Amino acid sequence: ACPHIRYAFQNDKLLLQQASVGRLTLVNKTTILLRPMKTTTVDLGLYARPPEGHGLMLWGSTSRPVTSHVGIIDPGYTGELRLILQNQRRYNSTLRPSELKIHLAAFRYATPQMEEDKGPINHPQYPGDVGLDVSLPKDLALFPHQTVSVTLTVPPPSIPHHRPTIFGRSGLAMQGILVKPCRWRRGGVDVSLTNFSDQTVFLNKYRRFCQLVYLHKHHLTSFYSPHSDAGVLGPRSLFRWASCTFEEVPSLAM
Ligand SMILES: O=c1ccn([C@H]2C[C@H](O)[C@@H](COP(=O)(O)NP(=O)(O)OP(=O)(O)O)O2)c(=O)[nH]1
Numbered sequence: 001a002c003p004h005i006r007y008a009f010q011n012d013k014l015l016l017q018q019a020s021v022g023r024l025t026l027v028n029k030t031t032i033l034l035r036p037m038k039t040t041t042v043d044l045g046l047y048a049r050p051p052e053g054h055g056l057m058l059w060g061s062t063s064r065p066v067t068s069h070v071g072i073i074d075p076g077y078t079g080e081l082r083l084i085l086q087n088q089r090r091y092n093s094t095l096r097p098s099e100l101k102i103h104l105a106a107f108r109y110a111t112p113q114m115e116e117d118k119g120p121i122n123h124p125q126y127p128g129d130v131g132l133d134v135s136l137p138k139d140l141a142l143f144p145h146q147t148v149s150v151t152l153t154v155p156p157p158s159i160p161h162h163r164p165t166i167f168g169r170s171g172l173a174m175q176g177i178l179v180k181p182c183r184w185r186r187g188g189v190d191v192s193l194t195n196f197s198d199q200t201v202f203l204n205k206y207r208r209f210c211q212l213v214y215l216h217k218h219h220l221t222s223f224y225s226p227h228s229d230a231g232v233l234g235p236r237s238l239f240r241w242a243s244c245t246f247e248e249v250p251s252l253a254m
């Protein structure tokens with residue numbers, strides 16, 4: 001099934017750790033400073049085109065007090081990929097070399113056919129959209145250092161062999177607001193938001209605050225192994241990415 005993920009990579013602050021087991025991992029070569037309750041952004045000098053019928057997912061994993069956004073990359077994006085990190089601590093902290101792994105992998109997804117929004121669920125913009133955006137059904141405030149859940153009870157459209165999952169949007173993650181990715185199961189979901197910044201953040205009713213992605217079910221496993229990662233989704237299912245090889249395509253860098 002998974003043909004080739006075509007990718008370019010140039011960054012002398014980062015190292016390619018391996019393009020095996022269907023997932024590309026980079027690792028930091030130098031210390032990265034993380035200012036407290038501020039957004040730290042790592043430009044990767046990484047570019048990538050997912051093979052047909054697949055999307056790319058981008059994420060950091062670390063053993064330090066730092067949370068990273070999980071990014072769903074539009075299958076048509078051709079720009080430099082960024083990792084967006086958020087700082088737990090209230091003082092300067094650092095990620096030493098290799099304390100930060102950065103992962104890029106693909107997954108099969110489907111797009112429901114919808115002419116209209118179904119409640120908070122915004123219909124797709126064209127047949128292949130990776131994620132449908134989902135709107136806040138009520139004005140929200142988040143005090144600094146607060147988590148808030150929003151409940152969605154609308155039943156998502158249904159697609160055989162696919163598993164509706166919620167991820168955050170990078171715009172909000174740029175603002176210090178992160179969504180905990182998780183399964184949107186049959187009777188509704190509670191989406192977790194955390195204000196990592198130092199200011200109250202007001203979010204307006206109807207604002208798009210996360211996105212719905214239909215992962216194929218082969219990407220959900222109950223097994224920890226080298227082909228899975230428990231850091232992406234909520235306890236219960238781990239994300240297992242497609243098996244793809246990477247094919248280096250220098251000319252994609254821009
Ligand atoms: O961690 C990430 C996430 C996204 N991206 C890029 C690729 C993706 O296609 C694009 C959009 O990401 P999101 O959709 O999560 N952000 P938002 O929905 O707020 O903005 P856009 O208007 O670009 O969809 O930005 C990154 O480089 N890193």
Ligand SMILES: [Mg+2]
Binds near residue numbers: 169
């Ligand atoms: Mg988006």
